[PDB]
Design a protein around this ligand. Structure first.
Ligand SMILES: CS(=O)(=O)N1CCC[C@@H]1CN
Length: 166
């Protein structure tokens, strides 16, 4: 029961024009089995378009590669990102938390996706009452990318709606 291929791909931007299918594969095979690895090139000149993609056998292998950033590939720091579900942001909206969800609930849950920098539990401008949603800001976009492709998020017993923010 393999994870969907779309969830096992990493788009690699910022490639050296010298990077090849073979050299990109040799690099990223350090973090797992690669079922696909392509450098995008011009159809007429064969000159590199400066980006490519690798497909791992499992999602855990994608995580391993992302946790090994920064990647310097053939002398150039590249920019890996998970495939589109790119709106590259570090902040999420968390809705459906009602009035009893506190900072530590959100922190304890979301800290396993990435390093948290800000947690903002929203309150009513007039009364101070909790409005039932929050924003979490991480230090890096991959946390958010992992979060928003999950079907479900359960925090403080609530089934929450989570999406990318601004
Ligand atoms: C992640 S990487 O393979 O590009 N690279 C950067 C420094 C550590 C490692 C070299 N072994």
């Amino acid at each position: 029961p393999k994870e969907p291929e779309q969830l096992r791909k990493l788009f690699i931007g910022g490639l050296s024009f010298e990077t090849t299918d073979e050299s990109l594969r040799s690099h990223f095979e350090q973090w797992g089995t690669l079922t696909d690895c392509v450098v995008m090139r011009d159809p007429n000149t064969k000159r590199s378009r400066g980006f490519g993609f690798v497909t791992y056998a499992t999602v855990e292998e994608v995580d391993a590669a992302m946790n090994a950033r920064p990647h310097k590939v053939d002398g150039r720091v590249v920019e890996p990102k998970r495939a589109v579900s790119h709106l590259t942001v570090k902040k999420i909206f968390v809705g459906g938390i009602k009035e009893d969800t506190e900072e530590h609930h959100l922190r304890d849950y979301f800290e396993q996706y990435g390093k948290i920098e800000v947690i903002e539990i929203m309150t009513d401008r007039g009364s101070g009452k909790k409005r039932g949603f929050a924003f979490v800001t991480f230090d890096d976009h991959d946390s958010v990318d992992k979060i928003v492709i999950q079907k479900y998020h359960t925090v403080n017993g609530h089934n929450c709606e989570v999406r990318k923010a601004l």
